[PDB]
Amino acid sequence: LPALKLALEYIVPCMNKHGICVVDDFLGKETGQQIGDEVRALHDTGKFTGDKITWIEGKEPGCETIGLLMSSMDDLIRHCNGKLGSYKINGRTKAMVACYPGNGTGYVRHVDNPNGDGRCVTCIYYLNKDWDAKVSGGILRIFPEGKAQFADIEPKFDRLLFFWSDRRNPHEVQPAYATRYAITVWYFDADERARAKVKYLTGE
Numbered sequence: 001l002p003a004l005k006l007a008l009e010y011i012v013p014c015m016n017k018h019g020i021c022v023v024d025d026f027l028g029k030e031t032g033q034q035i036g037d038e039v040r041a042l043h044d045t046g047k048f049t050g051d052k053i054t055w056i057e058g059k060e061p062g063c064e065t066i067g068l069l070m071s072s073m074d075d076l077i078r079h080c081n082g083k084l085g086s087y088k089i090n091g092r093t094k095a096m097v098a099c100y101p102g103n104g105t106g107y108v109r110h111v112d113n114p115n116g117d118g119r120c121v122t123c124i125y126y127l128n129k130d131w132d133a134k135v136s137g138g139i140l141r142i143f144p145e146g147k148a149q150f151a152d153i154e155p156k157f158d159r160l161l162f163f164w165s166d167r168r169n170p171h172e173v174q175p176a177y178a179t180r181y182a183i184t185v186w187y188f189d190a191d192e193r194a195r196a197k198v199k200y201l202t203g204e
């Protein structure tokens with residue numbers, strides 16, 4: 001589907017019904033591999049003589065295709081104009097470009113935004129080519145609040161994931177046995193983000 005059709009026919013009704021939406025084959029193989037090359041360049045540096053996080057705006061040298069990813073995410077969110085709950089999405093974070101070690105470590109269950117920090121939608125893009133979660137792990141488990149079911153989401157290559165960032169979606173990540181990368185972006189609700197910012201002295 002084109003971005004308009006995908007947003008209105010799939011992403012919007014999926015998010016309002018479930019709070020979780022998976023889009024597969026988001027950018028295609030060639031672009032996905034290019035993003036992987038850029039991400040590995042950021043994190044796979046050598047040496048002279050937890051996890052790794054970098055925050056990317058999208059116009060840094062060697063990050064142009066990460067920027068294309070962010071523009072593509074922005075395109076989908078824009079076409080959701082005012083249809084994602086009651087939110088008015090007026091901005092987002094930088095891209096969190098993460099490298100997660102394959103050392104048998106998982107991520108404890110948590111809520112991204114538990115206390116009204118302004119973030120209403122979490123977007124995650126998975127860029128590890130030919131990742132087989134059945135063999136290598138790394139599955140995301142989301143527990144939508146009050147539902148009888150929970151969801152396991154495999155970090156499949158070129159997969160885009162949306163979910164509500166607030167207490168509706170506690171989530172945990174199972175351990176993995178190879179290095180993997182994911183890029184996360186959070187979209188802000190205008191009113192909540194404004195309220196969260198009033199406490200600061202001109203300091204964001």
Ligand SMILES: Oc1c(-n2ccnn2)cnn1-c1cc(N2CCOCC2)ncn1
Pocket residue numbers: 053098100107111112173182
């Ligand atoms: O890194 C992840 C994963 N994950 C792990 C492996 N695969 N996916 C799932 N949530 N999550 C995360 C990270 C985060 N940070 C990271 C440290 O800086 C501050 C903000 N804030 C909220 N959620």
Ligand SMILES: [Cl-]
Pocket residue numbers: 109110111170171
């Ligand atoms: Cl939790």
Ligand SMILES: [Cl-]
Pocket residue numbers: 110
């Ligand atoms: Cl966290």
Ligand SMILES: [Cl-]
Pocket residue numbers: 091188193
């Ligand atoms: Cl902000």
Ligand SMILES: [Mn+2]
Pocket residue numbers: 110111112171
């Ligand atoms: Mn999280």
